[PDB]
Ligand binder design. Structure first.
Ligand SMILES: *[C@@H]1O[C@H](CO)[C@@H](O[C@@H]2O[C@H](CO)[C@@H](O[C@@H]3O[C@H](CO)[C@@H](O)[C@H](O[C@H]4O[C@H](CO)[C@@H](O)[C@H](O)[C@@H]4O)[C@@H]3O)[C@H](O)[C@H]2NC(C)=O)[C@H](O)[C@H]1NC(C)=O
Ligand SMILES: *[C@@H]1O[C@H](CO)[C@@H](O[C@@H]2O[C@H](CO)[C@@H](O)[C@H](O)[C@H]2NC(C)=O)[C@H](O)[C@H]1NC(C)=O
Ligand SMILES: *[C@@H]1O[C@H](CO)[C@@H](O[C@@H]2O[C@H](CO)[C@@H](O)[C@H](O)[C@H]2NC(C)=O)[C@H](O)[C@H]1NC(C)=O
Ligand SMILES: *[C@@H]1O[C@H](CO)[C@@H](O[C@@H]2O[C@H](CO)[C@@H](O)[C@H](O)[C@H]2NC(C)=O)[C@H](O)[C@H]1NC(C)=O
Ligand SMILES: *[C@@H]1O[C@H](CO)[C@@H](O[C@@H]2O[C@H](CO)[C@@H](O)[C@H](O)[C@H]2NC(C)=O)[C@H](O)[C@H]1NC(C)=O
Ligand SMILES: *[C@@H]1O[C@H](CO[C@@H]2O[C@@H](C)[C@@H](O)[C@@H](O)[C@@H]2O)[C@@H](O)[C@H](O)[C@H]1NC(C)=O
Ligand SMILES: *[C@@H]1O[C@H](CO[C@@H]2O[C@@H](C)[C@@H](O)[C@@H](O)[C@@H]2O)[C@@H](O)[C@H](O)[C@H]1NC(C)=O
Ligand SMILES: *[C@@H]1O[C@H](CO[C@@H]2O[C@@H](C)[C@@H](O)[C@@H](O)[C@@H]2O)[C@@H](O)[C@H](O)[C@H]1NC(C)=O
Ligand SMILES: *[C@@H]1O[C@H](CO[C@@H]2O[C@@H](C)[C@@H](O)[C@@H](O)[C@@H]2O)[C@@H](O)[C@H](O)[C@H]1NC(C)=O
Ligand SMILES: *[C@@H]1O[C@H](CO[C@@H]2O[C@@H](C)[C@@H](O)[C@@H](O)[C@@H]2O)[C@@H](O)[C@H](O)[C@H]1NC(C)=O
Ligand SMILES: *[C@@H]1O[C@H](CO[C@@H]2O[C@@H](C)[C@@H](O)[C@@H](O)[C@@H]2O)[C@@H](O)[C@H](O)[C@H]1NC(C)=O
Ligand code: NAG
Ligand code: NAG
Ligand code: NAG
Ligand code: NAG
Ligand code: NAG
Ligand code: NAG
Ligand code: NAG
Ligand code: NAG
Ligand code: NAG
Ligand code: NAG
Ligand code: NAG
Ligand code: NAG
Ligand code: NAG
Ligand code: NAG
Ligand code: NAG
Ligand code: NAG
Ligand code: NAG
Ligand code: NAG
Ligand code: NAG
Ligand code: NAG
Ligand code: NAG
Ligand code: NAG
Ligand code: NAG
Lengths: 434, 120, 120, 120, 53, 52
């Protein structure tokens, strides 16, 4: 009665993992990016319901590789600060230093190489205590932190670390499906799905426990976790309102440079103009308290309702995970958030967060690389939006800041996208025959 | 009216947008993107080769001489072309697909040898 | 008589060398050459896909069922096919090409459905 | 019955496995492998283009209007299809091949013009 | 052999033999005599098919 | 205690190796096979690595 009829161009797809191509408009948006962002067309698929999943999306991994790679490429033409791995004799800074700065800075002198092999120069500079390690226990002799492990590369001063959005576009034969459900928690069926040519631009902002400058929830705080009852998993909390944070490094720095070799210039802080004060960030107190109250209300939908939710500071680990790390105007800050997560919730003031500054960082969770961030001339101020939190969990539930892994930051933006392969060929019975 | 716009529609509606999707199948850093383009081409060519093997070259809708065993899907026409979307159909004949492709190949080979023996 | 030898000749003459041009469409340091080859292939395949969509697959000369609205070009068969070279013709109906391609696509879809509903 | 399984059989038998071979034509460190993939694709496309030029697009067996000049091979049918294997046949007529291909192209050009002049 | 190592640079370790415990002996390989003599006899038998018998 | 067959095969070499710090050197004692070193001057213990 019925016969097989072959159809080609059928609107069917299967999940697939392929390579996506970046499109943009200095480390980010390299020449390796098809210059477009044209009008990324969105074609609402109407009556389709697709099983979306973050915490499997391979787009997260591709972006991770890409970013790490772009970052490393930007250091390829830069000066290696290896001639400087020498004994640095150090003393205290001859200035007006507050108590919170004790000791925090050291005035270190050393014998540096120069342009001609038979010449040498005496150089001194100001180092943050976190970048140097005492040699011989209590002594004036100190070495740079990363001279016993990998060589440090100076970042090129002409290159800005400011995050530049990068759109991820599908190759022909593939499509990206976007979940538009405003209440979507990262997994399961998504009742409103549209097809897009390319994702929105995502800013590769690198921070830890407080996510900065991301997307906000449309209506309510959304708490997303791979398994909410599993204490080994992190919880990503997306806020529906930003919390403004104002960060500063209130010290007027004078930056000097020397030649350490043939066309190789090293930059360092020569001196400080004015008093020495601790770097810090401000969060409005009432705004922050309202923000946590909203988080608590949503946590109670997964945990008991007649419960107690307590917040606390990260319990341990290195500076990279116990603090809020971020890039503010090119400097690398490590802020103490114990002033934000110190309360118990049972059934125009501001909060000031002390911040440490480091010049020698590792960026990615790697051992074999180290970078020196040139100091920046003048005084630094930046303002950013807190758009989400990364929490971990211990009656009474206790939550603490987490965020050591970078993949999680990217998940907070890529959770709504899925990559599928188009499978245009198929068959069905019809009453027609040759 | 755009690409995959008919994905949520019934098979009898979606069959009218076959050209919409067909046209969206074609168009060290950069190596993986080059590999992706090459592989996309190979995928495309395999589907075209297969249509050629079955005698469907050059057309979007190809009628054949293979009958539909009710054991693959015992649904009637008003339950396949009016109540189902191609996505749901594909996940119903998924494990009878290779059987059908094999039959289509055999049917075409028999037809080619018989046509040649008729041109004598 | 070789590749593009007929480019300066009239359309009515040049149309007899279609195979000459068709056969010349195929075939980090060194990466740019692979990129060029891949793109040359994708270009080729897109031309073939359109011929497929319009029902002209497998042939260099294809007649269609779409008429010639005189608003595209009101020149008579004499002037087009015995004076103009293909280069001059292409520069005339350059603005009205996407329209023609769209009409050809629609005509073939109508033809495929009608044919199926006749073999039923 | 696998790929090239029929290579030692006679032409009249081997001709029944054409799909076995057709389906096995498609699917700095790594560049050489990309070059190989690209060239395999270009090779494939050139053969497909050639079948199109001759009017054999879409089929594994194609009869034409070119007659067999006996100067190429005066062996009879019972000697060609019952005994010789495709490898021995290929060796026998290998240097009269680019004459045959030229004739096939010319035949098709004439065939196309006659069908257009008839659809008028 | 007791193997020791030093750093010669920024995360760069060099390995060397530090010391030898006990007596110093020459490295060597053992081939069964009968097996080896049979093996050559077979090789010779076949060489004689290319060379004079 | 060296078997006769190994006499002259090994040499005990002391050298100045670089260190983590550019301005410092360390004394290192290691055991080399004779095949990997060559003499430099004769009637002297000045030897260097074969491929330098
Ligand atoms: C979250 O988003 C906010 C808003 O975008 C972002 O704050 C911005 O930071 C950048 C970088 O610090 C600021 O850009 C500077 O603006 C001053 C003002 O004129 C310029 O003088 C600066 O130019 C110098 O430095 C450049 C290198 O960065 C050199 O290329 C140049 O030649 C000059 O030497 C520079 O343009 C920008 O003004 C602020 N925006 C606001 C509104 O304050 C914040 O940093 C983001 N958060 C995170 C964690 O990234
Ligand atoms: C760091 O130590 C250096 C000396 O090693 C200080 O520089 C000297 O300061 C005095 C007083 O102003 C001058 O007379 C000398 O000429 C300076 N010497 C050099 C080489 O510049 C420097 O001020 C100290 N800096 C800090 C922040 O303590
Ligand atoms: C840099 O090199 C100078 C020499 O150019 C070092 O100066 C020596 O300092 C010590 C400590 O007082 C004295 O005992 C020496 O006599 C000085 N040398 C000479 C010849 O004057 C200086 O200490 C070096 N700085 C460092 C720590 O790298
Ligand atoms: C963050 O909050 C601090 C208060 O804790 C602000 O510090 C004051 O700044 C003004 C100048 O604008 C001084 O006159 C006051 O004496 C400072 N207060 C104290 C207690 O020292 C700071 O300006 C705020 N802004 C940020 C970080 O941008
Ligand atoms: C952030 O600041 C707090 C102080 O407000 C530090 O907390 C103290 O840590 C020590 C060592 O474990 C304890 O003995 C004290 O009892 C803690 N103080 C309070 C008030 O609880 C905290 O360690 C700092 N964190 C970072 C990453 O610097
Ligand atoms: C249809 O096919 C039957 C053989 O197929 C059996 O069932 C299908 C669904 C597959 O699971 C296959 O592997 C099994 O072998 C035959 O019994 C039957 O005769 C066929 N009917 C027709 C109309 O040919
Ligand atoms: C097609 O079948 C339709 C529904 O029939 C019932 O449900 C299906 C899934 C089977 O279980 C079948 O045995 C049941 O009887 C009918 O409503 C529809 O009218 C039928 N259409 C035609 C035209 O045959
Ligand atoms: C023929 O064209 C008429 C004019 O409409 C348009 O403008 C010209 C220049 C062309 O670009 C054409 O494609 C546009 O539609 C139409 O009013 C008329 O309906 C057309 N007739 C046919 C046969 O479609
Ligand atoms: C073809 O027309 C010639 C004159 O061409 C006129 O102008 C061109 C641009 C067109 O608009 C055309 O339609 C006009 O008629 C005549 O000289 C010639 O004889 C005509 N040839 C024929 C009858 O086919
Ligand atoms: C058949 O072939 C005859 C001889 O062909 C000649 O030699 C072959 C190998 C080719 O080089 C060919 O070009 C040469 O002409 C021709 O004389 C004769 O005309 C041909 N007959 C037909 C049927 O065309
Ligand atoms: C076919 O030919 C067999 C012998 O072939 C002879 O030599 C070949 C090269 C040709 O020139 C052929 O024409 C000659 O006859 C014969 O034994 C056999 O009977 C022939 N069979 C038929 C069907 O004619
Ligand atoms: C230098 O600073 C450290 C840390 O604050 C302090 O313990 C030490 O006594 C200071 N030494 C002098 C000479 O001021
Ligand atoms: C460098 O010194 C620190 C001292 O705290 C030590 O923990 C680290 O393991 C050392 N690195 C290497 C490569 O030995
Ligand atoms: C997310 O929502 C789905 C709805 O089907 C539910 O099954 C899943 O458990 C939820 N996951 C979390 C972490 O809330
Ligand atoms: C979450 O973790 C618990 C651990 O007891 C496990 O039993 C449960 O199956 C996990 N949930 C999922 C969805 O895997
Ligand atoms: C941040 O600075 C703006 C002015 O640019 C000010 O209005 C706002 O109150 C400050 N916020 C905090 C938390 O200090
Ligand atoms: C924070 O919220 C709690 C509970 O509603 C309230 O008691 C407390 O006063 C609030 N603090 C601020 C600064 O608003
Ligand atoms: C939990 O508390 C909310 C009010 O915040 C209420 O609307 C909801 O019904 C309660 N759920 C249960 C299971 O008690
Ligand atoms: C938490 O708040 C209490 C006052 O309620 C204060 O005494 C304590 O020091 C605070 N802890 C931290 C880590 O700031
Ligand atoms: C730092 O001090 C110098 C010298 O007085 C002055 O020219 C410069 O503007 C100051 N910069 C800032 C940010 O105060
Ligand atoms: C914070 O969010 C508001 C509202 O979307 C926006 O206007 C503002 O520019 C954002 N701030 C930053 C630093 O991006
Ligand atoms: C979705 O279903 C409704 C009927 O409930 C229909 O009107 C609409 O056209 C369908 N959309 C698509 C894309 O098929
Ligand atoms: C499927 O379509 C047929 C014919 O319109 C109808 O009789 C039957 O009830 C439908 N079944 C459903 C609603 O799935
Ligand atoms: C084959 O597919 C049908 C429809 O999806 C399904 O019901 C059946 O369980 C499948 N059988 C196997 C072996 O997976
Ligand atoms: C070029 O024009 C002349 C007339 O001036 C004509 O005879 C010749 O055939 C034309 N050449 C070609 C290739 O058509
Ligand atoms: C070439 O143009 C002239 C003038 O329009 C026309 O008379 C002639 O018919 C056209 N072509 C030929 C030679 O047929
Ligand atoms: C085609 O469009 C261009 C730009 O509008 C115009 O200059 C030209 O005259 C048009 N040509 C025709 C044949 O209409
Ligand atoms: C090989 O030759 C024998 C005759 O000697 C024949 O029977 C057999 O079928 C041939 N094999 C193949 C694959 O044709
Ligand atoms: C040649 O063909 C004949 C007829 O089929 C057959 O009897 C004979 O065995 C074949 N010889 C060879 C060499 O295959
Ligand atoms: C051409 O092929 C024939 C038949 O195989 C052979 O006799 C002749 O020697 C060949 N000529 C060449 C160019 O080798
Ligand atoms: C190698 O050692 C094995 C024991 O592991 C022994 O049986 C064998 O005879 C030895 N072979 C030779 C050639 O010494
Ligand atoms: C090796 O073979 C030869 C010839 O048979 C014999 O004379 C000799 O004794 C053999 N040697 C051994 C170790 O078996
Ligand atoms: C070589 O010697 C062997 C016996 O070892 C004998 O079988 C063979 O025939 C001889 N060959 C010749 C050419 O003498
Ligand atoms: C050292 O070894 C050499 C052989 O390399 C030998 O000639 C010499 O006499 C030895 N000297 C001593 C003191 O053992």
């Amino acid at each position: 009665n019925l016969w097989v009829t072959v159809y080609y161009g059928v609107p069917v797809w299967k999940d697939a993992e392929t390579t996506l191509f970046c499109a943009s408009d200095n480390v980010w948006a390299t020449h390796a990016c098809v210059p477009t962002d044209p009008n990324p067309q969105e074609i609402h698929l109407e009556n389709v319901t697709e099983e979306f999943n973050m915490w499997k999306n391979n787009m997260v991994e591709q972006m991770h590789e890409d970013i790490i790679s772009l970052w490393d490429q930007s250091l390829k033409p830069c000066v290696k600060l290896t001639p400087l791995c020498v004994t640095l004799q150090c003393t205290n800074v001859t200035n007006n230093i507050t108590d919170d700065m004790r000791g925090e800075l050291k005035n270190c002198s050393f014998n540096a190489t120069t342009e001609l092999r038979n010449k040498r120069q005496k150089v001194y500079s100001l180092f943050y205590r976190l970048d140097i390690v005492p040699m011989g226990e209590n002594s004036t002799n100190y070495r740079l932190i990363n001279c016993n492990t990998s060589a440090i590369t100076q970042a090129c001063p002409k290159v800005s670390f400011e995050p530049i959005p990068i759109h991820y576009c599908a190759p022909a034969g593939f499509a990206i499906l976007k979940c538009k459900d405003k209440k979507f928690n990262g997994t399961g069926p998504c009742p409103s799905v549209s097809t897009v040519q390319c994702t929105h631009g995502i800013k590769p902002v690198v921070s830890t426990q407080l996510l900065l400058n991301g997307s906000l929830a449309e209506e309510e705080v959304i708490i997303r976790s791979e398994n909410i009852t599993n204490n080994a998993k992190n919880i990503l909390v997306q806020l529906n309102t930003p919390v403004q944070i104002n960060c500063t490094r209130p010290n007027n720095n004078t930056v000097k440079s020397i030649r350490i070799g043939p066309g190789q210039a090293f930059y360092y802080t020569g001196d400080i103009i004015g008093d020495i004060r601790q770097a810090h960030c401000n969060v409005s107190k009432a705004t922050w308290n309202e923000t946590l109250g909203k988080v608590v209300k949503q946590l109670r939908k997964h945990f008991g309702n007649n419960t107690i939710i307590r917040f606390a500071q990260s319990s341990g680990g290195d500076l990279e995970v116990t603090t809020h790390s971020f890039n503010c105007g090119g400097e690398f800050f490590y802020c103490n958030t114990s002033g934000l997560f110190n309360s118990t919730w049972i059934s125009n003031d501001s909060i000031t967060l002390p911040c440490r500054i480091k010049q020698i960082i590792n960026m990615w969770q790697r051992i074999g690389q180290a970078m020196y961030a040139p100091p920046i001339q003048g005084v630094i101020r930046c303002v950013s939006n807190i758009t989400g939190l990364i929490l971990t969990r211990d009656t009474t539930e206790t939550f603490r800041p987490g965020g050591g892994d970078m993949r999680d930051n990217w998940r907070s933006e890529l959770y709504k996208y899925k990559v599928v392969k188009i499978e245009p060929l198929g068959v069905a019975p019809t009453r027609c025959k040759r | 009216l755009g690409f995959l716009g008919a994905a949520g529609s019934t098979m009898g509606a979606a069959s009218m947008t076959l050209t919409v999707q067909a046209r969206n199948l074609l168009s060290h850093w950069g190596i993986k993107q080059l590999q992706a383009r090459v592989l996309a081409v190979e995928h495309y060519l395999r589907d075209q080769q297969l249509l050629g093997i079955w005698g469907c070259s050059g057309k979007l809708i190809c009628c054949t001489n293979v009958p539909w065993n009710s054991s693959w899907s015992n649904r009637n026409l008003s339950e396949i072309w009016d109540n189902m979307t191609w996505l749901q159909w594909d996940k119903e004949i998924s494990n009878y697909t290779q059987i059908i492709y094999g039959l289509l190949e055999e049917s075409q080979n028999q037809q080619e040898k018989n046509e040649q023996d008729l041109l004598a």
